[PDB]
Amino acid sequence: APKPVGPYSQAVESGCFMFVSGQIPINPETGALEEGGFKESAKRALDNLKAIVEGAGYSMDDIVKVTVYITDISRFSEFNEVYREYFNRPYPARAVVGVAALPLGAPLEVEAVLYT
């Protein structure tokens, strides 16, 4: 399972919300980024989330907001794709940017909140 790295908690139960440190595509059991470079990562990084989310007894489709960060151009689509398999209608108001640099180099990263 994902292990927060640094000065953060990968989630906090305050109020009727759950704040999640932007998750990272590390094979939790291999503390290394995923293999592939494109979708793989963008796939696991999400699974990597799909997890903690569930920890605190919580359906993801219960998530009201999600905020992503992408290092690369257009893989909006290659990603936009993988997003679906996880969140089913309705969806959570979501942001999306083009960073330029990320932790350990990670292809992307994603925080998100949700009401419990």
Side-chain angles (χ1 to χ4, degrees), residues 31-105:
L33 302 194
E34 314 299 302
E35 233 327 281
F38 323 144
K39 178 203 289 185
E40 299 90 1
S41 297
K43 196 181 168 305
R44 171 95 222 204
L46 253 144
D47 303 296
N48 255 38
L49 176 64
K50 188 177 206 162
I52 290 68
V53 182
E54 308 187 313
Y58 194 76
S59 306
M60 278 216 269
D61 56 47
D62 198 354
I63 300 184
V64 274
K65 183 95 186 60
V66 53
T67 337
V68 189
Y69 305 113
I70 294 167
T71 307
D72 198 54
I73 317 136
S74 283
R75 289 213 181 78
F76 192 158
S77 58
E78 307 191 333
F79 152 63
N80 244 14
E81 189 183 301
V82 176
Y83 190 113
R84 71 190 180 180
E85 307 160 38
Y86 303 64
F87 285 91
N88 72 292
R89 288 264 281 173
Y91 285 138
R94 167 227 69 178
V96 262
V97 313
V99 294
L102 274 213
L104 314 205

